[PDB]
Amino acid sequence: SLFNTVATLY
């Protein structure tokens, strides 16, 4: 199951 909270570089 994927990670739920993937953040942008910026």
Place this chain on the structure above:
Amino acid sequence: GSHSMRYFFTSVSRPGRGEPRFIAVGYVDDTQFVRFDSDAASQRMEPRAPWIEQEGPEYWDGETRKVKAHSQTHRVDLGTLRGYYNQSEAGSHTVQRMYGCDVGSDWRFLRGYHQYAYDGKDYIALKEDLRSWTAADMAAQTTKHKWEAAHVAEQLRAYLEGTCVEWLRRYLENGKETLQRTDAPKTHMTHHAVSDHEATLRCWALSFYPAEITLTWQRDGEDQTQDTELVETRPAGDGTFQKWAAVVVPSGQEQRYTCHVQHEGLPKPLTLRWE
């Protein structure tokens, strides 16, 4: 023994040809189980192993939701990086991301990973302690500081040590007959004459799982590493793997050479000789 779950994401900008391509794949050990392709019709996370097909609608809806969010994240990131490196709007660039977890023979947390690349090289990676970052260059030091202040490590650590390992455990048991199997290589040797005075001995390993294997040749018990033709381990297409190793032998010298095979599925390592 040990097991792993890994997700692999690829985003490729296509300036003046629409949205960037985004491809996501999931693996347990050497078996692929899901995919998402931005250019496909479904616009959903899709099954690629028979054992994940029995996850219900809440699973597939949830995975579709998360992978589109990953996709949007990466779309945005291609722009950020183009600015960081002062690149033109016209050129195609690549971002890759990989994360997941390893468990040991106790199926308890062993190691976590989260790695990020731009145009084929390291950009930023989460270190082993899952608490700090390795920035590959000056651009990535900006990201490092951003990610520290937003506590990105903390969020990923909780996933990699907890939920990642729980889901890996669940897939292992639900796909027990696929994932918890070891298929020993079927091995044999071929002999072919290169001329009147030289022949090829090729040692074959076929239909094995997992992909991890060692194939070597010796001459009178001495390593032939620099004189062996060794191919990369390759998929058969049916979820098993193949590998071969060949040597050129002067005619009459066949009995001097031995091929040696190590694999998880063999009770004992094998030593094969021609006649």
Place this chain on the structure above:
Amino acid sequence: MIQRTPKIQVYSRHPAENGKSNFLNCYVSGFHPSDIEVDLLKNGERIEKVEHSDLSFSKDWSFYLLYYTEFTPTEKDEYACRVNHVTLSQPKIVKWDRDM
């Protein structure tokens, strides 16, 4: 920017036996960037129904793909894989050999 040439292997799934159904594979690996053209050829000619695996990559970031198609080998038919990539001055053609 980084560019790596594809390694190319052309082989069958099962030991090749004349008259028996099989799959012909072209495995391309170690390349970057991901844009790549791969064709399977029968007697010089592009095979129409060819599928491929989902794009994935190794520890070093280099991409790998499996291209494949059902086939029934014969004594006389010749098979090859034809690959193009930014690293190649012209398309690389690799012939299928049954003991490789």
